[PDB]
């Protein structure tokens, strides 16, 4: 039996709606839960899903270098797999292993329709429209590390305003877009889910970078390569595409 | 130095043009050549580029189970890395290792603009317009194995006409599109290169699947993970994007 760490994030992992309390694995559904189920069938393991205690994905404390979130659970061998929209990044790959990607995406901008804002550069060169990202996530880290003029400028803006423009979650960022003059730097996969459900919102510009989500494992785990092969099987038979359609597809904007 | 196996395929790998003779690695240019140079810089290795003798990527013969191409070079430890638009696939991952993807893509359709054909389904339902793929590549293999009705039908059509509709190169497929009534099933990255240069051609429909190109290594090689890390660094600093813009109406 494997211990699988994960985190609530629509539509990847959600609590099933129910009149009565549910228990154990029965509590959860979503794209990542379907993925876990499919992987379990192919590779023949059982599992217990556990929400990560600190509610974090995994970032390094910039003073002591210690990790948190699902990444820390893996490093500490508290979990066997992390199954979530966990971006494969340079810093994380140095401390844990990942399967090859089950989904590909990039940072982009969530904003309202009908404005003159067409790119990151348009946001960077002003301050009236505030903008931000989830604190300490892969998106924020991209900006923190970027040497590109536009993105460095955006980092200077966000970091100096971290108290007011950085958010704790996608949900908070999305609500900020809906209720104030704010543009949210966020992952394109999640943007697509949002824009299918709110016709007044749109992605602005294209993808600013490229990354994949992968299943995390402790470094050296034999499951990283096994899951890669299972993911390739699922992709090549069209299941990953069906899985995405199931959890994303909206009724039109 | 590491031995790096590769293959000519525009704009990934080409012979550099010069008025004077060129030697060694200097003979080559392209996206993958730039990639290799950058990987070299980060990881601190020297290397020798060699074109794969049999001019194949890597497929398994369904009679004797023998592999060929760059995949075979890696299996036999004749090369340390394969750096090319080499698709990461289930069957290849069973026999060699791969870095994580430096490019992501999918099978799609290259055809002419201004036609009624809007999807694979539209091709499958007819026979007047021929269609095909590079023989024995990842695209053909996708169709050969698929259980999705539309793709299974397309495979049945292609296999019954393989002498006439399967081609030996992307170049041959493109020439087929240009000189006959033919739609070519090919990788979306390469389609983008072609359509930026041939204004009468276009991608039809979306991506039929999703895959990545990765650097291949013999199975168990320590370089697969090292190259993954270097690729992630290159991506995050915007270098892969710059390289794409450089090499890619
Ligand atoms: C839901 C959020 C906090 C996660 C999801 N993937 C990114 C990560 O793996 O860090 C984070 C989003 C982002 O940074 O835009
Ligand atoms: C250039 C061709 C022969 C290669 C490139 N990638 C695919 C591969 O890795 O097999 C092949 C193309 C294709 O199958 O459409
Ligand atoms: Cl349970
Ligand atoms: Na790792
Ligand atoms: Na492998």
Swiss-Prot record, chain B:
Superkingdom in the source lineage: Eukaryota
Binding site for L-glutamate: 85, 87, 92, 138-139, 187
Disulfide bond entries: 199-249
All ranges on the Extracellular side of the membrane: 116-249
Glycosylated residue positions: 200
Tissue note: Highest expression is found in the olfactory lobe, piriform cortex, dentate gyrus, hippocampus, granular cell layer of the cerebellum, and in caudate-putamen.
Record's subcellular location: Cell membrane; Postsynaptic cell membrane
Free-text description of this protein's post-translational modifications in UniProt: Sumoylation mediates kainate receptor-mediated endocytosis and regulates synaptic transmission. Sumoylation is enhanced by PIAS3 and desumoylated by SENP1. Ubiquitinated. Ubiquitination regulates the GRIK2 levels at the synapse by leading kainate receptor degradation through proteasome.
Quaternary assembly: Homotetramer and heterotetramer with GRIK5. Tetramers may be formed by the dimerization of dimers. Assembles into a kainate-gated homomeric channel that does not bind AMPA. Can form functional heteromeric receptors with GRIK4 and GRIK5. Can form functional heteromeric receptors with GRIK3. Interacts with DLG4. Interacts with NETO2. Interacts (via C-terminus) with KLHL17 (via kelch repeats); the interaction targets GRIK2 for degradation via ubiquitin-proteasome pathway.
Function per UniProt: Ionotropic glutamate receptor that functions as a cation-permeable ligand-gated ion channel, gated by L-glutamate and the glutamatergic agonist kainic acid. L-glutamate acts as an excitatory neurotransmitter at many synapses in the central nervous system. Binding of the excitatory neurotransmitter L-glutamate induces a conformation change, leading to the opening of the cation channel, and thereby converts the chemical signal to an electrical impulse. The receptor then desensitizes rapidly and enters a transient inactive state, characterized by the presence of bound agonist. Independent of its ionotropic glutamate receptor activity, acts as a thermoreceptor conferring sensitivity to cold temperatures. Functions in dorsal root ganglion neurons.
Family classification: Belongs to the glutamate-gated ion channel (TC 1.A.10.1) family. GRIK2 subfamily.
Further information: The postsynaptic actions of Glu are mediated by a variety of receptors that are named according to their selective agonists. This receptor binds domoate > kainate > quisqualate > glutamate. It does not bind AMPA without coexpression with GRIK5.
Protein name from the UniProt record: Glutamate receptor ionotropic, kainate 2
Organism: Rattus norvegicus (Rat)
Residues of the full protein shown: 432 to 804 of 908
């Amino acid at each position: 039996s494997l211990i699988v760490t994960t985190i609530l994030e629509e539509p990847y992992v959600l609590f099933k709606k129910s009149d009565k309390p549910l228990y154990g694995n029965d509590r959860f559904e979503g794209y990542c839960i379907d993925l876990l189920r499919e992987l379990s069938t192919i590779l023949g393991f059982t599992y217990e899903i556990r929400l990560v205690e600190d509610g974090k994905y995994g970032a390094q404390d910039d003073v002591n270098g210690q990790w948190n979130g699902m990444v820390r659970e893996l490093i500490d061998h508290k979990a066997d797999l992390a199954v979530a929209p966990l971006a494969i990044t340079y810093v994380r790959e140095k401390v844990i292993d990942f399967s090859k990607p089950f989904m590909t995406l990039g940072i982009s901008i969530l904003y309202r329709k009908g404005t003159p804002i067409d790119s990151a550069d348009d946001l960077a060169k002003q301050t009236k429209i505030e903008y931000g990202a989830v604190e300490d996530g892969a998106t924020m880290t991209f900006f923190k590390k970027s040497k590109i003029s536009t993105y460095d400028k955006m980092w200077a803006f966000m970091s100096s305003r971290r108290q007011s423009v950085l958010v704790k979650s996608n949900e908070e960022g999305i609500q900020r877009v809906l209720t104030s003059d704010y543009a949210f730097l966020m992952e394109s996969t999640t943007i697509e889910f949002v824009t299918q459900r709110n016709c007044n919102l749109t992605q602005i510009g294209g993808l600013i970078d490229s990354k994949g989500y992968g299943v995390g494992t402790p470094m050296g785990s034999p499951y990283a390569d096994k899951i890669t092969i299972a993911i390739l099987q699922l992709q090549e038979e069209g299941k990953l595409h069906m899985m995405k359609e199931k959890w994303w597809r909206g009724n039109g904007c």
